[PDB]
RNA sequence: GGAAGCUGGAAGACGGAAUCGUUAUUAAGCGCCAGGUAGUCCUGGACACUGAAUCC
RNA sequence: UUUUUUUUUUUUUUU
RNA sequence: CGUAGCUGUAGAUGAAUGCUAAUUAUAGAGUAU
RNA sequence: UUUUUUUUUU
């Protein structure tokens, strides 16, 4: 439709919009609450204080919201994941009444609850899991495919739940088996589903045989940007045979089909982030394309910052060296890029590379550092990048600022370790002590200790630390040193997990007194 | 011209529900509670089980069943001839709503607990 | 607090069965005024309340087929008065009751008011410098018009609520409810 | 008036409810209220149990 | 439980709901400040004034 | 007649169960009542107006009925309260005792023949209402 | 009158001297007469001002050939009063009861009101019956017609100066409202 | 600011440029512009306003000044450290001249007369954002400092006397931007502000009391 | 034509109008044309301002297809039906496929047939044939030339219900059948986890096979391979069975492909929701007194869905309600499908337009004598309403 | 004793003849309640709207 | 009132 | 408020309303077909 | 003399 919106320009710059829609929310009808909530979703700036006010009042006004209204309100929470400890009590108070045998709510309710904090066993998991396993005879083809992405992100699953969806696809796919009817309908519903279940290290005998291509002469399956699903599914424990019929294909070995600048480089790069795959001898050809692509001015300020951030991990797969291509050959006059939208993406990239430089040969092995001159050049880039963010700090959303803290605290370790010039003002005013809306973590249901939980401010924005269990529980080659100071397996993909885990342990020791911490809690890839 | 409810479209015989969207007159209230007697009896936990035969769906449509429903419904709208002027009958939904909510009778639309209201 | 109360208003009503008796009360009440200590005496407002009437019917001499009728009219009179800011209770209550004459009853209606937290704020205003870088009529109430408007609105609100609630609880055979037995 | 009530549960509740309503009703005299309930507890006790 | 949701989770297990118990509090206060009459069988005699 | 009685049994409006010394509701309120200690202490903390009709006239051989009414009025807007507490105030009393034009609530109590007896009753129930509203 | 309202309004536009109090009053006259039955058949106004004018047919076609610069005034007219102060100034309680009629002792009706009616020539006192004032379109009816003219003057490849008036009308906030789904369509074009 | 259809230098052209920046920052569809453009635009008028005759009634009133300051308070763009724009406006002649040209109750009428005929400011609309912007300016914190204190105190004393008949939404903003670290000390003492704070809370108890300084308090934004 | 020409009457040929509108005149115009004594006189229609705003939108919509243009229907609320007499004939002259239906209620308050089915939607074999027969009178020469897609072959049931929605009615019957047959495998612990999961796996295998053998939908086997959409003559031949299946097939076909602009106009849309004159045993105690709701039938339901206008990639729908068949009352527009930004609320005729209407009747020799002195006097009497103006002047001599 | 559902083939289109009277918000129609101290009338009392004609 | 309504009238009262 | 205006049915040769296996309400009691 | 709504239709 033709979207249109009018601003309150009665007096042409009178009053304050953020303040105007602050007091009225305290005393308003239930219908007006939903209308005002949508305003912040599409707003530019975000006020952490206003977010808590709406959450607190939602629980009190939950006695007049219709079931459809609750789902619509919960849908708006998808973006900028934010929640409060009082929000869970409101949704749990009406979820049981919403169980009217819904066909589509099985996916919408589950997808919305995936983020924030859920999986509460004796409030939410018991009715949802009991009603989803017995309603497997009416799931649509589109819904089944989407459910694969949901179960993949879960933690600590159960055999009855995993097996329910495994057998659903076998019978559903058989009906379509007996060029657009198979090339985009049959193969699409096979590799997409296999990857979802493969995350939970689960597989049956009556799924692998059917999922794999029975005929080895079945060429022209998927393009370069879809064949990675089959490769990612295998290479887990003992999986093989799916990769290529005899390691000799016609569209996935000779530089794929065709790689060019015609809106193809970004698509392949984006697919490599959510798929746990290492660039082998054949997959390393993508890095070479960056050298020529970066030369063009259009590509230098349209997709350059996005590609660098989205593929910073696995340094020996995108960049020839950590400082060579990460320098500023011609960025002196081209540093600015849409105020802050792309400028902040460069800051995070420079932080992750720093961790790899130190943790290379100082007790981690797996490589070696470069000449000392590399560090000198790297510092020349960060010094002139943080200053531009000072006047543009207010133009960042809640999600943008949340990830900034993780990359900001990293620079406060190497500098003082025994440097950055703007490390005593910008890094010690707001970047060190942030008070943005802290979302709840994603905890499992294996411990069964939900009756004694708390919250402590730290790097992961909230945690589980109660007064009764305070400082008391949650607080060979790959276990001795990798399970100690590192505490991160090279499943998932560690470059990001190691940085987040190490910072959490330090933040909980500097301020709070929390000893004998058992990290564990490694989510699937 | 000869509309039901008068100029102000009065409605002193219908009851609204907080959940879903469904309304019915007091005439159907008697039949609903009698039909859903198994759920009410089991909720609490022979002389007590006296109205069991009335739960039949076909018996209500017979001659005997028609008289039973009319006996309980006293037609509150009808009264004495002297009840004229200010002494006019009011909406009897106040008493019906209390019994319908206390008995915990499920709604035909959606199975829910006491959610009825005056309207 | 009892000491914090004050008589906001005092509606004084009369009910006389004769025209002459009602006229005598008006003259007596006026004479009691213009004699208090304050410069202006309390001057209440007038508010007539119509004149209800009743007249039963009877057949008319016995042993007749109802060819003629004789009626007996029984008229009545009413009068209401309003008061505002009754500072002196002795000079108002005594005057109203002392103005009666004959079979002329009365029905007063007191109205008190309690004050909450006394607003005490706005101290001596700050100040800085640039850095160089009567009218009282004869027969009228002395009270302010703003006070009467604030009190008058309250009276109209209570009357509407009482009529609505009274109509609800008005049915023949009190204590009878449908399908109660 | 509430000093002794019928032993039977059915009769105890029937008479008990009347006490709460009579005390909050206009039209009955103070003397009549006492006598109304005093004679009610006796007639109920002189009858077979409600079971 | 956490910190603030301590009483909400506990009430859920006991069977409390945000719609049923809400009306119980209103009725509890209403019955105290008003009469106890609820259409019980036999209360029609106490409402009629004495003649 | 028997059929109508059986109907009230199913809905649960009968005293049928599948000495005692109880406490009457009136006596319970008397026990729980914070009274003032002398005239100089403010019991309530909000404005309120008390109205009552007093009959005066010549010596009548008989008493005039309908001369013992007592009611209290207060404005909800002046009374500062939270959003949740404000809604409960109008729900307990209902919309009949609330005016949508000015925004005032009138509470009338008349269950006694005597004026003095009725006047004291109003003051007891008024305090109890505020105890439950703030929750 | 209709024959003098347009002349006053036109003079102000040339001199750029408008009035927020006088503009609304003169806008009603230009609307009532425009839709009058005698619009096309009626001849010119007798002031000689219309003799040396491009348009003719009295007010019928005179307003149809009105410059687009002056057309935006009707659409973009401020109808706010002086009491409007709840946006920039601060709190302000508006009154809604000017008249406060209170009786006295010297002008009180006598007790015997039956004879009072018999001492009058005709009925004077009557039940309380007062008629309120209902606001008409207040010039909004004419403004809607003018808004459609700007829509047609977009795809004609006109001058930039003439096109500025179209945006002003489409950017209204108190007259056009959002009745019809034409605002986004005109803006997109 | 009513620029609508030059004496010495930079008097009329400044108004035109002032409104142009606010128009581009008003958009609510995407990013207004680039950060580099803002610095170039800001520096364009930075030196131009310096030579604006450091007089007469031809002085930039607070009415038009507040229109520019309002846009920067909603687009998420922080104003630059440059303060030369604040040293050529308001305090310079818009206050001293007002007092030069011709009891407790007398103080209230003094400030009230300002917005009577000439209307140098839009009551609590334009000056309302002036206090908020001066608070947040130097957003980070472990002569600009001296001038900020003088400006905040001067505008605060002109609103306190009439801080009883204002809109509740406007009162919150004024009170909010006083109990902050950036605000000068010895302003919240038991003179006019300590007892006046509880007055607003009593009228609107539904608002947060303990967390008064949470919107734009010691945390800046 | 333009803003300058507002409130004028456009002459129309008597013979040309009949061909353009084979069904009949739009609205109650048939009552006003019979009053003219002359048989060779033309027909005139006033050009109201409401038509100018609507006509401009259609012009831009056609040029785009060769997100700026509107992609939803409108609604006329409040002379709402008067514009239909001028908007339909004009569109048809511009090579537009217009669906004409001024009297859609004729298929709900007349003699017909109803046959209950499991889908819960009553069909009308007698009225189903008249829908296509009347539509092809003027819309011919275009349907045959239009091709037919292959992605929407035969997925409709006999009553026009979709296969997915029709099979859901039998879910309850099949649920009990499988529960009783599970005893064979239930009666043959092992880890207490795998034993229960294996038993549940049997239900999925049996359910998949049960949902594809018991149900035997009719995939229009009479026409194996169609070539066009107008070549379906078998629908007119058989009426007992193949009457509603073909009706819905054409409706779905005119959403997917886009070759020509389409338009649908449904008049008197306020009488489709209320109850019909039919009698059945589907009443909810006392909601209908044993009557079939009008919206529960086949034909009325097809023209009682405004939220589906988004699927119309070719054109859009439009409706208007001005008659007094039922009191509008509140007439909630939010709980019906239309939005508050798509309602055109017309007003009474202006004094300028009123004068033209009176003068128009004079040329037709309708009135005897209408002096100009009383021209404005009659404006206040009838209030300028069209219904009150024609009736008042007809009864009396006029003027 | 009053009212209501269902059922319905109680007795009547006779006589333009004749006897009871209306001084126009008259006559002719239609609708409401106040009292008769539980219910309990087609009469009496009492209010309001449409409201024509003639030689009276 | 071109983001306004969505419609018959009574026997005491705006003192 | 009733005959409304307006507007669907049959532009009634067939609209008469009493008779009664059966219930509604007041009352201490108005019951039997 | 009689209107839709808490959602499972390409």
Automatic annotation (TrEMBL), chain B:
It comes from the Eukaryota. Keywords: Metal-binding, Zinc. Zn(2+) binds at residues 17, 20, 107, 110. This is Uncharacterized protein. It comes from Toxoplasma gondii (strain ATCC 50611 / Me49).
UniProtKB/TrEMBL annotation, chain C:
Residues 37-60 have a biased composition (Low complexity). Residues 37-60 are annotated as: Disordered. This is Uncharacterized protein. It comes from Toxoplasma gondii (strain ATCC 50611 / Me49).
Automatic annotation (TrEMBL), chain H:
It comes from the Eukaryota. This is Uncharacterized protein.
UniProtKB/TrEMBL annotation, chain I:
It is found in: Mitochondrion. Its main location: mitochondrion. ATP binds at residues 32, 46, 79-82, 322-323, 390. One of its GO terms (cellular component) is mitochondrial small ribosomal subunit. InterPro entries: Ribosomal_mS29. Mg(2+) binds at residues 81, 267. Keywords: ATP-binding, Metal-binding, Mitochondrion, Nucleotide-binding, Ribonucleoprotein, Ribosomal protein, Transit peptide. Signal peptide: none annotated. GO terms for molecular function: structural constituent of ribosome. Belongs to the mitochondrion-specific ribosomal protein mS29 family. This is Small ribosomal subunit protein mS29. It comes from Toxoplasma gondii (strain ATCC 50611 / Me49).
